[PDB]
Amino acid sequence: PEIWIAQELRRIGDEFNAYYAR
């Protein structure tokens, strides 16, 4: 249930670190 949001947050969070500054 809520664990999906956590996995979505790492997914969204890992994408932030990828395409951040450069």
Added chain:
Amino acid sequence: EERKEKREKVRAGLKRAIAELPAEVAARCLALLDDASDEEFIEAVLEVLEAMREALVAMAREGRLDAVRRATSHINEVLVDAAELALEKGREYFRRLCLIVCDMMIELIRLEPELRRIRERLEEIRRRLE
């Protein structure tokens, strides 16, 4: 039992994350992590996370875009286990993590010059939890 496993993995990624911080904040986050017993752990994690959110945004406006990246990656490699544990102790402990982590990244995205897609999803995930 696996609570202790997930706690050491959260203790490890957060330590690696804190090592990318200046020594003034790297001391308090590090003492809060190791002086919190085993049921204030999630509170200390949310405390260390709030200090880290406070720290990485200042360095993001400075130009330390590389330290914020390396630090957040270690926040990311333990983000799921921290939410699972926080959900084990209380649904509010889950919600506190986003309001730290989601708000952290949102301001980090709102600072770097030149994706709104990720900022978008982060805002609603915050709203949906609020």
